[PDB]
Structures are given as structure tokens and as C-alpha cells.
Amino acid sequence: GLKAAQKTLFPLRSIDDVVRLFAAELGREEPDLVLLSLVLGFVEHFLAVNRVGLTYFPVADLSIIAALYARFTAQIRGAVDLSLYPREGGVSSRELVKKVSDVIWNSLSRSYFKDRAHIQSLFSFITGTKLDSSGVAFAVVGACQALGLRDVHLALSEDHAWVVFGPNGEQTAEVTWHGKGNEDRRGQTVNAGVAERSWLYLKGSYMRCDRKMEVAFMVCAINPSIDLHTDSLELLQLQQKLLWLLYDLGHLERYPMALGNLADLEELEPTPGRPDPLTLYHKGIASAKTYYRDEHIYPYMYLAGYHCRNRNVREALQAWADTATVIQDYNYCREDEEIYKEFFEVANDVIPNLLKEAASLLEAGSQGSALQDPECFAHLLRFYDGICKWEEGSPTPVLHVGWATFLVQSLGRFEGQVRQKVRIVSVPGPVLTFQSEKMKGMKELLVATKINSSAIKLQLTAQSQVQMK
Ligand SMILES: N#Cc1ccc(OCCCN2CCC([C@@](N)(c3ccccc3)C3CCCC3)CC2)cc1
């Protein structure tokens, strides 16, 4: 409307007043996405973008929020004439969804830095005519809710967003761009991407949000960063409290990434009486296993990151091996570059740094060292095996000689007497089975006291020949 009942908590004078508003909306039949996004974007603007004059909390007066809300709903209702797009069965048409998408797109500034912070919310859309890629998808869903189109929902993979709609919520439509320089497929289905088994579309095991999950998304989308060195404590607390609210109401049940986000917040500043970060990372993984066929990568990356920051090398390696065990059953496609970057950084920067420190600490006489644990060597091998298996049958390759130099270095961090204790068994303490042909052929090389660097490089890159002189 806004409806009279939506107005009664205003003004919002504190973090807890914002939480109250969210609790009230979440108790309603259809929480108002437009209201909630505007409120979050307003408070984020005045806590992270411009803190001038801040003394405690940027008071959100009804007149201010109602005027932004009226700006949004006038823009959408004025531009989308529903009479041109008749709705059979309380469900929307592809042409209507494309029209809403066009309205949002055409409203945006012609040129801006697309990966700025703080351009995720409808506050950014209205005040700066700027949205990020997923922010466009969210805005389309909000616009559709404003129009009364109850069937249009947000769909999320781990790196992209689109919408579902239509009979049984079975249709898909692209509504935003992905990446940089990829020509957009706005208006089309996601079926080609599902069919090619790319990570971008998760083999169809992507999130189909309900209205509560869309609230969770906008909460995850809060960006407390003020600058490279500085987060808003007020926004961290708000996001954390809102995520707990959502958790308590059941709305994180099917949202792995949100559980990882909450775990990270709890690591930073734990809430008394709440589960530990580790419990929450494991709940994220459980969510992915239960609802998404264990086809998500980030539940395991979140866990690995926590173990890495806490120098639990064994457990970090195990979680990265688990990441690779998920990726192995995908085809590496155009538009999957973000996950390639994640794996590249782990293999070629993070793991080497962790193992270098471990080596120094072993020299200093550490006991229980990951470098003396054959199960840790097995996790490292399983990580590479999943990456190599991922590469098999993909339309673009993954491995190259850059990766091989780091593999050889990482292998060398383990003494031969440790490496010799892993039992590599064939289909048909530690025991490991390799799924990739690359690692099966490398087995022979993985225990020599002196790693044959040149042979390992040849096997990992499948390089046919060596230099002529
Ligand atoms: N080791 C390790 C490691 C740990 C965590 C890690 O990434 C955790 C952050 C994952 N990232 C995924 C995309 C995600 C997001 N960019 C996203 C999520 C789904 C669909 C599109 C975009 C946002 C979610 C709320 C606003 C947009 C932001 C969080 C990477 C490596």
C-alpha cells in the first residue's frame, strides 16, 4: 500500500526497530519485498556510504520511506500495463516477465561500475538508478510483487540469479546479465545451461525461493563494508540479528549460503546461547545435501575458509577435498569462471601458504602436524583428483603448467615416509580411490622420496613432448 499495519512501527530508530519490522512482515501472508529492501538500503546508505552526522542510528521516518516506496510503485505501475498481458490461472506469462525486466533494465544509468558495493537494493535503484547483476533480478521480483504477480519468484544459483514463474512455478526466465562481456539471454529459459551441466546452473539444483527466502536473500545482500579496512559494526549486527530471526522462523532451512554467512558473522562476534560457527557451516552442508542433491560448492568452501583461518590444516584440506568431490561431476563451461578462480586461488595460493607455515612449524617441532599425517596427504590428493575429473569431458580445460608447479611444491611438503602411507586403491591406514585418469596415472610418482617434478608436470597437463634441445 503501504497498508496501515505496515506503518505502525515507524519511525525506525534502532537496529532492533528494523528487526521488529522484519518480524512483522515475515508474520504476514506476503512480506513486502519493496518495503524491506528500501529500508535496508536506506539504513545501509547512512551507515556505510555516508556517515556524516551519524550519532547512533539513521532514523527511518515513515514520510521518507513512504515517498521512496511511492517512487518505486509509480515507476512500475505506470510502465507495465497489466491489461496488455492477461493472466490465466493466477499465473504470469513470459511476455509480462520480460516487460517487467525491460522496465527495470531501461531505468538504469547507461554507464556505471557494475561491481560497486551498495548497489544491491531498491534504495540504490531509486536514488542512484544503479543495480548490480543479482540486484536486477531481485528488483524484477519486487516489481512483480508490487504488480500482484504472486507466482514470480527469485531463482539463485551460486553465481547467478533469474526468475521462476508460471504454471506450477515451472517456467524459468533470465532477467539480468551475468559476468562481463557475456551477451545476455534475457527472456530465455535456463534449460540449455542446466542441460550442459555447468556449475552456473547447478544441474538444476538451484534455489527456487519463496517470499521468505527472498527476504533472506536481501538480508544476505546487506554489505557492511565502509572501505577495504572497515566494516560498519551497526550493519554487521543488523545482518546477524536478521539472519537469526530468519533461522528461528525456519526460513534458512533451504538456504545453504545464508547459513554460511551467519556462521561467518558468529565467528566474528558470537551471540551467547547460539550454535557455534562450525555447527552452522555443517547445517549449510546438510541443507545442500538435503535439498540440492549435494551439488553446491560453497557450503564446503565456507567450512574450509573457517578451518583455514583457524589453522586447522587437516580439516581445511578435508573441506577443500569435499569441494572438489562436488565439482568433479560438472562440465567446466563458459560462464563458470568464478568457480575456476576459487579453485585456482585455493590450489595455487592458499594451500601453498598454509603448507609453508606448517613446514616452518614442523621444523620448530610441532606434533600432530598435518605434514606428518597421511590422511592430510590423502585430502590433498583427493582435491586434485576432483579437479582433474571436473576437467574430463568439459568443453574447456582447467589445468595448465601453472598449476603443476604448485602441485609439485605441495607434494614435496610431505616427506616420502608420510606419502608412502596412503593406500591408493583401484575401482575395482588411509585409503583413497581416484576418479580421474590424470591422478590414476600419477599414482606411481606420488611416493618417490624425490618427487619427479618433470614427470608430474607432464601427467597433470598431459603435455605430449619435452624440449628438443
Ligand atoms: N576457502 C574458501 C572460501 C570460502 C568462502 C568463499 O566464498 C564465500 C562467499 C560466497 N559468495 C557467493 C556469491 C554471493 C552472491 N554474490 C550471489 C549469490 C547467489 C547468486 C548470485 C550472487 C551474493 C549473495 C547475496 C547478494 C549476492 C556472495 C557470497 C570462497 C572461498
HEC states along 367-414?
CCCHHHCHHHHHHHHHHHHHHHHHHCCCCCCCCCHHHHHHHHHHHHCC
**Rounded distance between C-alpha atoms, residue 398 and residue 376, angstroms:** 24
423, β-bridge pairs: 431
The total of other beta-carbon atoms located within 10 Å of residue 27's CB is 9
**Rounded distance between C-alpha atoms, residue 273 and residue 270, angstroms:** 9
Expressed in angstroms and rounded, the spacing between residue 213 Cα and the centre of ligand 1 is 16
Expressed in angstroms and rounded, the spacing between residue 282 Cα and the centre of ligand 1 is 17
CA of 346, closest atom in ligand 1: 1
Which amino acid is residue 273, in one-letter code?
G
Q: Whose CA is nearest to atom 26 of ligand 1?
A: 221
Residue 55 CB-density burial (10 A; 0-12 exposed, 13-18 middle, 19+ buried) = exposed
Q: Whose CA is nearest to atom 24 of ligand 1?
A: 221
Any alpha helices (H) in 221-276, and if so which ranges? 233-248, 256-268
Contact between 320 and 300 under an 8 Å Cβ cutoff? The reply is: yes
**Rounded distance between C-alpha atoms, residue 444 and residue 451, angstroms:** 10
**DSSP-derived secondary structure letter, 177:** -
**Rounded distance between C-alpha atoms, residue 252 and residue 259, angstroms:** 7
Contact between 387 and 330 under an 8 Å Cβ cutoff? The reply is: no
Pocket test for ligand 1, best of 220, 265, 311, 349 (most atoms within 8 A of CB): 220
Q: Whose CA is nearest to atom 19 of ligand 1?
A: 158
Element (H, E) at 172: strand 171-173
Q: Comparing C-alpha atoms, which of 450, 370, 369 is closest to residue 416?
A: 450
Q: Comparing C-alpha atoms, which of 308, 206, 313, 224 is closest to residue 261?
A: 224
Contact between 326 and 300 under an 8 Å Cβ cutoff? The reply is: yes
**Rounded distance between C-alpha atoms, residue 319 and residue 43, angstroms:** 36
Block residue for cell numbers 585455493: 346
Contact between 369 and 418 under an 8 Å Cβ cutoff? The reply is: no
Expressed in angstroms and rounded, the spacing between residue 300 Cα and the centre of ligand 1 is 12
β-bridge pairing 153-156 and 207-208: antiparallel
Phi, psi of 230 (to 5 degrees): -145, 125
Phi, psi of 402 (to 5 degrees): -55, -40
β-bridge pairing 431-433 and 423-425: parallel
**Rounded distance between C-alpha atoms, residue 426 and residue 428, angstroms:** 5
Whole-number CA gyration radius for the chain: 25
**DSSP-derived secondary structure letter, 365:** T
Say how far residue 142 (Cα) sits from the centre of its chain. Answer: 21
Q: Whose CA is nearest to atom 5 of ligand 1?
A: 302
**Rounded distance between C-alpha atoms, residue 160 and residue 185, angstroms:** 13
Q: Whose CA is nearest to atom 25 of ligand 1?
A: 221
Element (H, E) at 442: helix 437-442
Pocket test for ligand 1, best of 157, 158, 262, 297 (most atoms within 8 A of CB): 158
Pull the grid cell for residue 322.
569435499
Pull the grid cell for residue 37.
529492501
Say how far residue 398 (Cα) sits from the centre of its chain. Answer: 21
Q: Which residues line ligand 1 (CB under 6 A)?
A: 134, 156-161, 220-221, 298, 301-302, 304-305, 308, 342, 346
Expressed in angstroms and rounded, the spacing between residue 338 Cα and the centre of ligand 1 is 10
Q: Whose CA is nearest to atom 16 of ligand 1?
A: 159
Contact between 244 and 262 under an 8 Å Cβ cutoff? The reply is: yes
> What region does 178 belong to: left with phi over 0, alpha with psi -120 to 50, or beta?
beta
Q: Comparing C-alpha atoms, which of 130, 139, 24 is closest to residue 72?
A: 139
**Rounded distance between C-alpha atoms, residue 138 and residue 447, angstroms:** 52
Contact between 125 and 98 under an 8 Å Cβ cutoff? The reply is: no
Residue 255 CB-density burial (10 A; 0-12 exposed, 13-18 middle, 19+ buried) = buried
Expressed in angstroms and rounded, the spacing between residue 158 Cα and the centre of ligand 1 is 7
Contact between 209 and 181 under an 8 Å Cβ cutoff? The reply is: no
Expressed in angstroms and rounded, the spacing between residue 1 Cα and the centre of ligand 1 is 33
Phi, psi of 156 (to 5 degrees): -135, 130
Angle 171-173-175 from CA coordinates, rounded to 5°: 155
Contact between 430 and 399 under an 8 Å Cβ cutoff? The reply is: no
Angle 200-159-303 from CA coordinates, rounded to 5°: 105
Any alpha helices (H) in 158-210, and if so which ranges? 191-195
Pocket test for ligand 1, best of 134, 315, 345 (most atoms within 8 A of CB): 134
β-bridge pairing 153-156 and 161-165: antiparallel
**Rounded distance between C-alpha atoms, residue 109 and residue 87, angstroms:** 31
Residue 225's alpha-carbon distances to 44, 113, 233, 262, 281, in angstroms, are 9, 17, 9, 16, 22
Contact between 122 and 142 under an 8 Å Cβ cutoff? The reply is: yes
Expressed in percent and rounded to 5, the helix, strand and coil fractions of the chain are 55, 5, 40
Which strands form 207-208's sheet, in the order they lie side by side? 171-173, 161-165, 153-156, 207-208
Pocket test for ligand 1, best of 121, 302, 312, 335 (most atoms within 8 A of CB): 302
Expressed in angstroms and rounded, the spacing between residue 64 Cα and the centre of ligand 1 is 32
Q: Comparing C-alpha atoms, which of 48, 64, 181 is closest to residue 116?
A: 48
Question: Reduced to 3 states, what is the DSSP secondary structure of residue 298?
Answer: helix
**Rounded distance between C-alpha atoms, residue 122 and residue 143, angstroms:** 10
Residue 197's alpha-carbon distances to 208, 297, 298, in angstroms, are 18, 14, 17
Contact between 307 and 315 under an 8 Å Cβ cutoff? The reply is: yes
**Rounded distance between C-alpha atoms, residue 166 and residue 92, angstroms:** 5
Resolution of the experimentally solved model in angstroms = 1.5
Pull the grid cell for residue 326.
562436488
Contact between 259 and 288 under an 8 Å Cβ cutoff? The reply is: no
Block residue for cell numbers 589445468: 399
**Rounded distance between C-alpha atoms, residue 363 and residue 360, angstroms:** 5
Contact between 304 and 325 under an 8 Å Cβ cutoff? The reply is: no
Contact between 370 and 358 under an 8 Å Cβ cutoff? The reply is: yes
**Rounded distance between C-alpha atoms, residue 352 and residue 407, angstroms:** 9
Expressed in angstroms and rounded, the spacing between residue 298 Cα and the centre of ligand 1 is 7
Residue 104's alpha-carbon distances to 76, 79, 99, 109, 116, in angstroms, are 8, 10, 9, 11, 18
Technique used? X-ray
Pocket test for ligand 1, best of 252, 298, 343 (most atoms within 8 A of CB): 298
Say how far residue 239 (Cα) sits from the centre of its chain. Answer: 16
Pull the grid cell for residue 83.
491489461
Contact between 219 and 202 under an 8 Å Cβ cutoff? The reply is: no
Q: Whose CA is nearest to atom 8 of ligand 1?
A: 302
Extract the runs of DSSP E, i.e. beta strands, from 210-329.
225-227, 230-231
Block residue for cell numbers 568457480: 339
468 Cβ partners below 8 Å, 6+ apart?
none
Expressed in angstroms and rounded, the spacing between residue 260 Cα and the centre of ligand 1 is 9
Question: Reduced to 3 states, what is the DSSP secondary structure of residue 278?
Answer: helix
Question: Reduced to 3 states, what is the DSSP secondary structure of residue 467?
Answer: coil
Q: Whose CA is nearest to atom 12 of ligand 1?
A: 158
Q: Whose CA is nearest to atom 31 of ligand 1?
A: 301
CA of 220, closest atom in ligand 1: 25
First to last CA, the chain: 78
